[PDB]
């Protein structure tokens, strides 16, 4: 009887946007329904004078069975009452023509080794998430330290997404 309601989930307390900046390599992911980033998913976060966070994100996308596309996207993050929860507005500059928006929750991070991202797109009537995606980010693409592995596995299970993540490759397909 685990509480899988989206409102009951806990996020990074006192989230620091400036310390979260820099390169983040997604090593594992949980997919939503429909088309989504496949692999080689690298994120680059930044903060400006005003303190508003922004980021760029590259990644390979399998559109049809015989077409690979290195998506190159830019996004801005709007602040909310919770410092770890944001409203991400994003768009493409290479292939993706349209724009969209999702919630961007930093569930937990130590800023210099790992980070667990979460985003619920659709909510069930009971409060649980009907359609979600999540990323296990890392500063080092070679791997995570032992302590980072333990926290990630714990947070993944607390989000009710145990054994639903798949690993993803970084082989320089998009440079
Ligand atoms: O859904 C998409 C792109 C998309 C939209 C519509 C159809 C297909 C796709 C996809 F490219 F296949 F994923 N997202 C959501 C997640 N989004 C991110 N996820 C994790 N971190 C980041 S940092 C950042 C984005 C971003 C978008 C812009 C800056 C990547 C773009
Ligand atoms: Cl699409
Ligand atoms: Cl694009």
C-alpha span between 35 and 135 (Å, rounded): 16
Q: What protein residues have CB closer than 5 angstroms to ion ligand 3?
A: 71-72, 92, 94-96
Experimental method: X-ray
Structural domains present in the chain: 1-175 (2.40.128.20)
Burial class (CB in 10 A: 0-12, 13-18, 19+), 10: exposed
User: If we measure between CA atoms, which residue out of 62, 58, 33 comes closest to residue 122?
Assistant: 33
Rg of the chain taking only CA atoms, in angstroms: 16
Pick the residue whose CA is nearest to atom 9 on ligand 1.
36
* Resolution of the PDB structure in angstroms: 2.3
Q: Is 98 annotated as a binding residue?
A: yes
**Measured CA distances, 25 to 18, 58, 87, 169 (Å):** 17, 10, 21, 10
């Amino acid at each position: 009887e685990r509480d899988c309601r989206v409102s009951s989930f806990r996020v990074k307390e006192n989230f620091d946007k400036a310390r979260f900046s820099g390169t983040w390599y997604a090593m594992a992911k949980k997919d939503p329904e429909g088309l989504f980033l496949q692999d080689n998913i690298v994120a680059e976060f930044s903060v400006d004078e005003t303190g508003q966070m922004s980021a760029t994100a590259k990644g390979r996308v399998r559109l049809l069975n015989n077409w690979d596309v290195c998506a190159d996207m830019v996004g801005t993050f709007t602040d909310t009452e919770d410092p770890a929860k944001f409203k991400m507005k994003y768009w493409g500059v290479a292939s993706f023509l349209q724009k969209g928006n999702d919630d961007h929750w930093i569930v937990d991070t130590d800023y210099d080794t790992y980070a667990v991202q979460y985003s619920c797109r659709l909510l069930n009537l009971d409060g649980t998430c009907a359609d979600s995606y999540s990323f296990v980010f890392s500063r080092d693409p070679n791997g995570l330290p032992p302590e980072a592995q333990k926290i990630v596995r714990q947070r993944q299970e607390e989000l009710c997404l145990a054994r639903q993540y798949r690993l993803i490759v970084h082989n320089g397909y998009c440079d």
